[PDB]
Design an enzyme around this catalytic site. Structure first.
Site, PDB file in Angstrom:
ATOM      1  N   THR D   1       0.884  -1.016  -0.046  1.00 34.48           N
ATOM      2  CA  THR D   1       0.029   0.179   0.120  1.00 34.48           C
ATOM      3  C   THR D   1       0.855   1.306  -0.001  1.00 34.48           C
ATOM      4  O   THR D   1       1.909   1.520   0.574  1.00 34.48           O
ATOM      5  CB  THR D   1      -0.956   0.137   1.272  1.00 34.48           C
ATOM      6  N   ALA D  49      -8.425  -2.758   5.675  1.00 39.39           N
ATOM      7  CA  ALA D  49      -9.361  -2.156   4.478  1.00 39.39           C
ATOM      8  C   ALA D  49     -10.920  -1.960   5.092  1.00 39.39           C
ATOM      9  O   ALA D  49     -11.468  -0.784   4.937  1.00 39.39           O
ATOM     10  CB  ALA D  49      -9.421  -3.081   3.289  1.00 39.39           C
TER      11      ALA D  49
END
Ligand SMILES: [Mg+2]
Ligand SMILES: [Mg+2]
Ligand SMILES: [Mg+2]
Lengths: 222, 231, 244, 212, 204, 233, 195, 240, 235
Positions: D1, D49
């Protein structure tokens, strides 16, 4: 020490077409190296033209599907028999999953149907409720075997037009339901060859504006 | 008189006036009819409007695929009781994979209403209910009173002027019980029954509310142009 | 059910008065008179015990004047038992504050706290109010010497001189007549006793019918001393001021 | 990420990658790591998430209730604090969040708050969060100016994610760009890293180490 | 890690002829780091003296707690609390936290105002009372204090002789403990006069 | 969270053309100690259902009481308790499965593996499994514990798929079950020779056989086996 | 957070606090102000676990501001420090304790004296001429022990503080990105914008 | 717990406990609020039935809720303290979570909400208090003045009065206050406020309190002499 | 005394019937539903000229697609509005969609009968809830303290309601434009109001599919009042 979780194997696959959607899954249920059942349905019609599968730990998967089906029932009661749209069902499932954020449903959930414009839709969830609308998604044991194949044969990844040598991509032409079902069958046939938890049978649920249809295919039983 | 201040007080003749006053609210309510054959069960309800600009108050509530009721009296109380029935039908399906028997549904409604008649602070429910359903023993029709009294019947009516419809059904008993495998004729009999309770007004397209459940028929409610066929 | 027997202690009258508060004030008007007078160099608390007996053990008796801490004392008018409930709560509040901030509780903060407790009984709970009026005599390093009163409504006000209990109308007029701002404790002692002597319902004011206390900086140097007078000391000050 | 957000003359640039991994397995290349809280507020996804999706969607609901009650746009300060106060209640339970709450109001101007699952709430001009954050910071720090144009700022955010996507194994897929103005955010498209890399290599002359 | 030896410190109390003595070091630390040389560990509530060793936050907390409780005691009882009564209060208060205790080692010292009898007492962290005739020790150098007190102590010492004995017991015990020292205070207590002396000692 | 103390081993079952068969031995083990030799682990519910339980026996006795209470409760205010509104195998299973999953979700499981065998109102065969995790599944043959590893392979040779069920008679099915119980006795160290067997047929109803024994055992060949390799004598 | 220093001179209290905020691998910020004004003449600096530091500081700030409004009066530095100590002493036996160490620098307007209180997360309070938390004292106290005088001016205090920071910058392994310095005196609180 | 419904409807659709709470407000000392162009002034009546009062320590009629907002009231004094405490706590809570002080409207809405709640909660009676809440929103120079009452309704006012003889002073304000041109200065606003109270008060001595609130947390209470100068100037113009 | 949840001999709840009397004393509110939108209008009724009338908030937004007007004890409406807003937002959070106007109304009406010896008495306020959804289009509901809600093509509540409702009976037809509805609300408000209607003592609002819920500016309403005056003088 008591372990509240288990692994019942299984592999599921959801593909969104232009005006249809399929959700497929093998019918084999296992623990460790034993087969519990050669035919234990894993993909369900939940009403309102929505199909669902929660793959992983079967007890949590059955509980989640049961609760969602119940949520559809109460949605009708509370909102004048309004049809639950696929996007609304997806957000609802997030909340069901995240409600057990600190004692999760040990499953990978996928739902399929049509959106409010009649286009094919597939939604994918993680065990704690994070979700996304996707075009193609395999879940479960043999997901790592299937998804690269789908990237190549559905989205034409790494495929270029002959003569151009990498300058022009293979164009993304729409696939028919018959074409999709071929890829699904070949995906599961290949997965059955190389993954020990995959086999016995393949049940596909196809969703169109006309409703939900089922197709069943045998898989190798070894 | 001196004994109607609350539900926790018997009168000297052994009456419960608050319960009787709750019963009175049903009599003020609009007429609704229930009747059944051996294959189907039907609810017919005369909906009431506030005025010509207003909608007609809905009378019929679905409780499950195989069960539902019609109301007469305080509508919010019907919502509370019908919600409870929905939950109980649902509990039976989820826990026991079993459709809740109509007779057992009546017992549950009786007991829920009873608790409100014996305790201080509370009040009786101010609504009457006609529950129809199709279960493992066929078609059923129940009449609920907020006194707690639940009764299984072939046909009945509650609300204002319900006596006319009730007498008609008492005459027609031998005919409408035999209307098997013909939903339209059973509804006709119900529409003709509720017509015996009308004065000054007649059955219009937004006035009439019909529900049916049967052998291969989920509980469905008909309103609007869907009941013009029966007018 | 039970509603039938509920007096509804926390309701307004049509005139916007609290019945029980008003009736509690009526009760307090029959209690022995208590007087507080604030001077520049201290505070005086004087109070009349109610029609006593010769067999009452006075030297161990306390019905009017109570110590809340080393800096704050109260005079009571009304139900003594009700007062002791509140007094104990006030004593705890003072100690809570001392533990929290490591400083003695300012007088008004203590007064406000007790007054808020009284207020609560008039607005919620359905219980009767405390039939007590307090005179608070205290000292802190912010405002110095302070006099307050609180009543069953939970309302409190500050005073230079004040009376509670019986004959407050007559007492307050007498105090208003002879009080001056530059007054000293010894003068205030005399005023308090003279006022009680005139307003009393008894035939004569004697030592056995009085409770007396002073809060003085007449404590060696930069500190404050509370003095709850003994029976003999009340007898002496009565002779000194020329009442007996 | 890899997620970033930086303040500049023309507002805020928000840039994120699109990759999600489970160990070495690339689960998705099409993940939306910018959460559209509302038409004026954006939030970035890093950590869990679900935690980011769920609570920043919830945040949007709280921001909507605020403006209904107060008849005024919520401040970025107040919106970010609603989130940080919430996650602080859960501290110790296991939430994993690293986000930048980005907005542009009248009273504040362009504002970014780094909010984090251990309760941290930091206001700042440039933030970078994720496994590839260090790579993105290098490009940002050496090229950032307050007086960047909207066009150049958008490219800088795009180029910084690319830098991370190249070197960081757990960053890649595609780049999502946003430009946050006072009148709301504006989406500036999805950019496949595969195609973008070669394009940038040729046009910029960078990545000479890589054969193309 | 061990809460009773994070901050360090010691307290000792002795009896004499018509007198008692209580003494403490002045150190507060964060393990190896010396933080304060003015952290007195002896407090008094009227004529009753309390020394407390152990975790410094609990030392402070307990002082505030016993001030609170002795102040209310006085208001209700209309008299100052006595050493024997206060000892039971400390024991009660400590045991009420039996399964979440204050990490302290209290020591009580005083003379009963009515009988004139000298009194000392010690406790463990959960309230067990040690009522010794001779001496009570507490702290990170308690072993050292036991050794000093056991040899130096003799009964019925006069106030000015008891001062030397207890001072030398503390000083030499503290000098063999890394977490004690940085100054010292000694209280000499008689029925109606109390003298407080700060001692000169090595500051390492 | 606990540990099983007194335990019961395999429960095995299969479907045949007109019904289902289920079987389980009569042993209650205490670790390696074969403590209790008269334990009935097949519990009939009415005349259409038999619940076979393995695992913790104290939890089995608790479940046995729940089922007994279920029958009592169903009869309350129910004129058709012995007819249309009698308990079905599917009702009994769903109830147990609900309890098992609830208990595992409170981290206090009933340490069991359960097979509910029966015949529905419409004559349909019912055979479904549930365990301490709340995991459920159905198959033409079902078995718990060791039976899953040794009995299923043998029983699946008779009924390998759904279409084999109508071709399988009760005589062939019972024969297969009885042989499997012999194989388990040979090879499961926590098994006993004594067992119970129940048949639920849509025509002949519930037949409950107690005090059965494993017979026709082969042991004679053991006399020729000497040493562990080189021994001739 | 990392370094927080405090020094009480003749007529003021000076608090110095580092500017760095580090989240593991990267320094996310280099201008962080690790302090809150509790009242016009009382400042509190803080260091400890992420999140808890600011949460605790703002909670204290809110409470002191509430007291100030209710009584129309500023609590003494001693009273504020006692309130803070109790909150931390309460916190240490909670389900999840505040892992926060503080310095409270205040000017008492009644006594006309500066006051510095050091309180750790256990609720350990000491009044000091100079103080620190963490490892800051290990590097700086030998310098303060040598040079400190009770009659120092504010300027001399700042110079001694610079020497302390220089020693920290030399021997400390971590880059704390300098310090923000604030002065508390009879006129209130002000920040030294060049240090 | 005590759950008795004290506030209930009567046959004519009135809640008498709420209406009787207003009668308590009618008995309370008069309070008045007037907003100028760049200020708000709160005037309060002090009944001179109580002398020998210590004015240093006696609870003042105007209370700061925050540094920028003030609250005055008419009715039960003890009741008002509970509302003031709640308002002060909410003011700090708002600063803590929103990182901005309350607007005057928000604070009013909160206090009014508390009052309403006490009119349909079991076991409680309504507050016998009406309030005037005045101040300036953060970073705003527009004057704000709101009123609340026991029922929980609230509204904004150019000028308003509550308490005993408030009918008379409202009469005065309605003919003397011009909306097109409000009191342009602090002087004019204070003068109009003192004038309005002089219609009702008695002696202009220690019977009138005046508090001036200006933008940016600038709040000050006028002393006896300062007010006495207004009282003097008003009557000297009146002798004509 | 007598129970708060007591039935009368006629079968009506005393407290509910009495709260209806309080609503009759309230200021007038009118709603008119058309195929182009729903209009909501209210009488402000300031008690004094010194009261700043734009602080009178009797028309309120629940969501972008739902508005609400009130009449009666308006302080009681605040918790009802709070609940409505929370319900609207919560449903969007759970279902990623707008909530149906009827479902919102039903949620509000569920609060109504939650009183006894829960709150101590019924609400003393009636609500006109207007909105739009995709399934049933433009809708207007009348929510009462009895817990009952009726859908209306047009409805008036408050002190001038029966005179206004008779007027709405004659004027409403299924082909009304939004502009025609606006003037109609203004006309009927003007008829039943004590004081003379202007932009300061009356307020208009509407809900359309495109623009959502909007409270009208005083300048916008003032023009519609002038347009009304001229068309009434036109015959
Ligand atoms: Mg195999
Ligand atoms: Mg040493
Ligand atoms: Mg050393």
């Amino acid at each position: 020490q008591f372990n509240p979780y288990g692994d019942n194997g299984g592999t599921i696959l959801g593909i969104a077409g232009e005006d249809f959607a399929v959700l497929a899954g093998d019918t084999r249920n296992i623990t460790d190296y034993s087969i519990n059942s050669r035919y234990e349905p894993k993909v369900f019609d939940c009403g309102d033209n929505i199909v669902m599968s929660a793959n992983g730990f079967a007890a949590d998967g059955d509980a989640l599907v049961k609760r969602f089906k119940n949520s559809v029932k109460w949605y009708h009661f509370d909102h004048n028999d309004k049809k639950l749209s696929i996007n609304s069902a997806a957000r609802n499932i997030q909340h069901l999953l995240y409600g057990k954020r600190f004692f999760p449903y040990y499953v990978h959930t996928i739902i399929a149907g049509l959106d409010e414009d009649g286009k094919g839709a597939v939604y994918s969830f993680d065990p704690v409720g994070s979700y996304e609308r996707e075009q193609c998604r395999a879940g479960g044991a043999a997901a790592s075997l299937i998804m690269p194949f789908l990237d190549n044969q559905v989205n034409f990844k790494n495929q270029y037009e002959p003569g151009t040598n990498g300058k022009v991509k293979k164009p993304l032409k729409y696939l028919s339901v018959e074409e999709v079902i071929k890829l699904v069958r070949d995906s599961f046939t290949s997965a059955t060859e190389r993954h020990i938890q995959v086999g016995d049978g393949l049940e596909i649920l196809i969703v169109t504006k006309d409703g939900v249809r089922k197709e069943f295919y045998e898989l190798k039983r070894d | 008189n001196n004994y109607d201040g609350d539900t926790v007080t018997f009168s000297p003749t052994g009456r419960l006036f608050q319960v009787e006053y709750a019963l009175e609210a049903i009599k003020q309510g609009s007429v609704t009819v229930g009747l059944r054959s051996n294959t189907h069960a039907v609810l017919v309800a005369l909906k009431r409007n506030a005025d010509e600009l207003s909608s007609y108050q809905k009378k019929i509530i679905k409780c499950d695929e195989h069960m539902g009721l019609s109301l007469a009296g305080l509508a919010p109380d019907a919502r509370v009781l019908s919600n409870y029935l929905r939950q109980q039908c649902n509990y039976s399906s989820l826990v026991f994979n079993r459709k809740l028997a109509v007779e057992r549904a009546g017992h549950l409604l009786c007991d829920k209403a009873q608790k409100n008649t014996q305790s201080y602070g509370g009040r009786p429910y101010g609504v009457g209910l006609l529950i129809i359903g199709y279960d493992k023993s066929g078609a059923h029709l129940l009449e609920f009173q907020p006194s707690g009294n639940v009764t299984e019947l072939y046909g009945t009516a509650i609300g204002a002027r319900s006596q006319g419809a009730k007498t008609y059904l008492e005459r027609t008993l031998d005919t409408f019980i035999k209307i098997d495998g013909n939903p339209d004729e059973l509804i006709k009999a119900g529409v003709e029954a509720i017509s015996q309770s009308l004065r000054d007004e007649s059955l219009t397209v937004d006035n009439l509310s019909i529900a049916i459940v049967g052998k291969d028929t989920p509980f469905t409610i008909y309103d609007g142009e869907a009941v013009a066929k029966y007018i | 059910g039970s509603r039938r027997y509920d007096s509804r202690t926390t309701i307004f009258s049509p005139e916007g008065r609290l019945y029980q508060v008003e009736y509690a004030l009526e009760s307090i008007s029959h209690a022995g008179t208590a007087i507080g007078i604030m001077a520049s160099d201290g505070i005086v608390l004087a109070a009349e015990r109610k029609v006593t007996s010769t067999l009452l053990e006075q030297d161990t008796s306390t019905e009017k004047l109570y110590k809340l801490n080393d800096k704050i004392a109260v005079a009571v008018a009304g139900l003594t038992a009700d007062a002791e409930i509140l007094i104990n709560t006030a004593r705890i509040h003072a100690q809570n504050y001392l533990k929290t901030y490591n400083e003695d509780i300012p007088v008004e903060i203590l007064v406000r706290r007790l007054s808020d407790i009284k207020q609560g009984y008039t607005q919620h709970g359905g219980l009767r109010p405390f039939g007590v009026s307090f005179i608070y005599a205290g000292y802190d390093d912010r405002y110095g010497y302070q006099l307050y009163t609180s009543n069953p409504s939970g309302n409190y006000t500050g005073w230079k001189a004040i009376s509670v209990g019986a004959n407050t109308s007559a007492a307050q007029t007498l105090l208003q007549m002879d009080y001056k701002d530059d007054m000293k404790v010894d003068d205030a002692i005399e005023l308090a006793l003279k006022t009680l002597s005139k307003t009393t319902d008894s035939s004569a004011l004697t030592y056995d019918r009085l409770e007396f206390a002073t809060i003085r900086k007449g404590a060696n140097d930069g500190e404050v001393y509370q003095k709850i007078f003994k029976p003999q000391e009340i007898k002496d000050i009565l002779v000194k001021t020329g009442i007996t | 990420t890899t997620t970033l957000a930086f303040r500049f003359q023309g507002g805020i640039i928000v840039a994120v990658d699109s990759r999600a991994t489970a160990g070495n397995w690339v689960a998705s290349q099409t993940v939306k790591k910018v959460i559209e809280i509302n038409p004026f507020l954006l939030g970035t996804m890093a950590g869990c998430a679900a935690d980011c999706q769920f609570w920043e969607t919830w945040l949007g609901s709280q921001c909507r209730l605020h403006e209904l009650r107060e008849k005024e746009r919520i401040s970025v300060a107040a919106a970010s604090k609603i989130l940080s106060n919430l996650v602080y209640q859960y501290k110790g339970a296991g939430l994993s969040m690293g986000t930048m709450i980005c907005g542009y109001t009248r009273k504040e101007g362009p504002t970014i708050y780094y909010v984090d699952s251990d309760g941290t709430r930091l206001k700042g001009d440039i933030f970078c969060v994720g496994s590839g954050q260090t790579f993105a910071y290098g490009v940002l720090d050496s090229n950032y100016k307050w007086d960047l144009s909207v066009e150049d700022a958008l490219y800088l955010g795009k180029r910084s994610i690319l830098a991370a996507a190249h070197r960081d194994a757990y960053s890649g897929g595609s780049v999502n760009l946003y430009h946050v103005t006072e009148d709301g955010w504006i989406y500036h498209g999805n950019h496949d890293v595969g195609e973008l890399f070669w394009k940038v290599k040729e046009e910029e002359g960078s990545f000479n180490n890589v054969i193309g | 890690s061990d809460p009773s030896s994070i901050n360090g410190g010691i307290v000792v109390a002795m009896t004499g002829k018509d007198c008692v003595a209580i003494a403490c070091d002045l150190r507060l630390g964060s393990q190896s780091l010396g933080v304060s040389n003015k952290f007195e560990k002896i407090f008094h509530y009227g004529h009753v003296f309390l020394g407390i060793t152990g975790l410094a936050t609990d030392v402070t907390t307990l002082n505030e707690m016993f001030r609170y409780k002795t102040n209310l005691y006085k208001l209700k009882e209309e008299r100052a609390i006595e050493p024997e009564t206060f000892t039971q209060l400390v024991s009660s208060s400590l045991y009420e936290r039996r399964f979440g205790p204050y990490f302290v080692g209290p020591v009580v010292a005083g003379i009963n105002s009515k009988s004139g009898k000298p009194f000392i007492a010690g406790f463990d962290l959960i309230g067990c009372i040690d009522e010794a005739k001779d001496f009570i020790v507490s702290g990170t150098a308690s072993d050292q204090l036991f050794g000093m007190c056991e040899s130096l102590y003799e009964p019925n010492l006069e106030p000015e002789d008891l001062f030397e004995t207890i001072s030398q017991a503390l000083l030499n015990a503290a000098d063999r403990d890394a977490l004690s020292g940085w100054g010292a205070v000694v209280y000499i207590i008689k029925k109606d006069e109390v003298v407080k002396r700060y001692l000169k000692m090595r500051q390492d | 969270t606990q540990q099983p103390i007194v335990t019961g081993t395999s429960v095995i079952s299969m479907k045949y053309d007109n019904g289902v068969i289920i079987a389980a031995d009569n042993l209650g083990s205490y670790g390696s100690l074969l403590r209790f030799n008269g334990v009935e682990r097949l519990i009939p519910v009415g005349d259409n259902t038999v619940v076979g339980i393995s695992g913790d026996i104290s939890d089995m006795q608790h479940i046995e009481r729940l089922l007994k209470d279920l029958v009592t409760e169903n009869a309350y205010d129910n004129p058709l308790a012995d007819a249309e509104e009698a308990l079905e195998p599917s009702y009994i299973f769903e109830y147990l499965a609900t309890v098992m999953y609830q208990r595992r979700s409170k981290m206090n499981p009933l340490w069991n593996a359960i097979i509910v065998a029966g015949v529905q109102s419409n004559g349909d065969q019912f055979l479904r499994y549930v365990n301490l995790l709340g995991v459920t599944y159905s198959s033409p043959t079902l078995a718990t514990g060791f039976g899953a590893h040794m009995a299923n392979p043998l029983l699946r040779k008779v009924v390998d798929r759904e279409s084999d069920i109508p071709k399988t008679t009760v005589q062939v099915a019972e024969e297969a079950i009885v042989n499997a119980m012999r194989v388990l006795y040979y090879r499961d160290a926590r098994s006993s020779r004594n067992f119970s067997l129940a048949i639920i047929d849509k025509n002949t109803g519930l037949t409950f056989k107690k005090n059965l024994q494993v017979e026709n055992m082969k042991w004679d060949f053991a006399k020729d086996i000497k040493g562990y390799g080189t021994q001739k004598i | 957070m990392d370094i927080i220093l405090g020094i009480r001179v003749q007529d003021s209290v000076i608090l110095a606090s580092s500017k760095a905020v580090t989240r593991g691998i990267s320094v996310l910020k280099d201008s962080d102000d690790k302090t809150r004004q509790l009242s016009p003449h009382t400042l509190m600096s803080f260091a400890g676990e992420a999140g808890d530091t600011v949460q605790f500081a703002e909670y204290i700030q809110a409470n002191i501001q509430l007291y100030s409004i209710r009584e129309d009066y500023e609590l003494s530095p001693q009273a504020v420090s006692s309130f803070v100590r109790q909150e931390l002493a309460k916190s240490i036996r909670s389900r999840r304790p505040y892992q926060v160490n503080v310095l409270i620098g205040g000017y008492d307007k009644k006594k006309n004296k500066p006051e510095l209180y050091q309180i750790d997360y256990l609720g350990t309070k000491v009044e000091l001429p100079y103080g620190a938390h963490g490892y800051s004292g290990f590097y700086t106290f030998s310098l303060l022990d040598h040079h400190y005088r009770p009659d120092m001016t504010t300027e001399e205090g700042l110079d001694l503080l610079k020497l302390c920071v220089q020693e920290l910058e030399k021997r400390m392994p971590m880059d704390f990105k300098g310090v923000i310095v604030k002065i508390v005196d009879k006129d209130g609180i002000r920040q030294v914008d060049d240090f | 717990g005590y759950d008795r419904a004290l506030s209930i409807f009567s046959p004519d659709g009135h809640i008498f406990q709420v209406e009787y709470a207003l009668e308590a407000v009618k008995r309370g000392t008069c309070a008045v609020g007037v907003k100028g162009k760049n200020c708000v002034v709160l005037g309060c009546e002090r009944r001179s039935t109580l002398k020998l009062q210590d004015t240093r320590i006696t609870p003042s009629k105007v209370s700061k809720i925050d540094s920028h907002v003030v609250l005055s009231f008419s009715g039960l004094n003890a009741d008002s303290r509970i509302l003031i405490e709640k308002a002060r706590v909410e003011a700090q809570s708002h600063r803590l979570t929103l990182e901005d002080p309350v607007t005057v409207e928000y604070l009013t809405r909160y206090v009014a909400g508390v009052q309403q709640r006490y009119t349909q909660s079991g076991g409680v009676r309504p507050f016998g208090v009406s309030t005037l809440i005045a101040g300036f929103d953060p970073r705003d120079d527009e004057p704000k003045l709101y009123q609340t009452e026991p029922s929980g309704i609230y509204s904004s006012w150019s000028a308003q009065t509550i308490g005993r003889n408030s009918k008379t002073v409202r009469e005065f304000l309605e003919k003397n206050y011009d909306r097109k041109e409000p009191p342009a200065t602090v002087e004019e606003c204070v003068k109009l406020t003192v004038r309005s109270l002089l219609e009702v008060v008695q002696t202009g001595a220690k019977n009138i309190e005046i508090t001036v609130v200006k933008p940016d947390s600038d709040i000050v209470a006028l002393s006896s002499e300062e007010i006495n100068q207004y009282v003097t100037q008003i009557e000297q113009e009146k002798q004509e | 005394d007598r129970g708060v949840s007591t039935f009368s001999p006629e079968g009506r709840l005393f407290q509910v019937e009495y709260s209806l009397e309080a609503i009759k004393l309230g200021s007038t509110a009118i709603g008119i539903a058309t195929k182009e939108g729903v209009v909501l209008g209210v009488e402000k009724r300031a008690t004094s000229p010194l009261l700043e009338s734009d602080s009178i908030e009797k028309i309120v937004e629940i969501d972008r697609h739902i508005g609400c007007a009130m009449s009666g004890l308006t302080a009681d409406a605040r918790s009802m509005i709070e609940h409505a807003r929370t319900a609207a937002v919560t449903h969007n959070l759970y279902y990623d969609e707008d909530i149906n106007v009827e479902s919102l109304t039903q949620s509000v009406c569920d609060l109504a009968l939650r009183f006894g010896e829960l709150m101590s008495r019924p609400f003393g306020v009636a609500l006109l809830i207007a909105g739009h959804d995709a399934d049933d289009g433009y809708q207007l509901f009348h929510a009462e303290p009895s817990g009952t809600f009726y859908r209306y093509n047009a409805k008036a509540i408050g002190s001038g309601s029966e005179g206004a409702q008779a007027e709405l009976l004659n004027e409403w037809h299924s082909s009304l434009t939004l502009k025609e509805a606006e003037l109609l609300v203004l006309k009927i408000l003007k008829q039943v109001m004590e004081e003379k209607l202007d932009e300061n003592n009356a307020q208009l609002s509407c809900i359309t599919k495109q623009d959502g819920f909007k409270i009208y500016d005083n300048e916008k309403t003032a023009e519609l009042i002038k347009e009304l005056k001229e068309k009434e003088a036109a015959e």
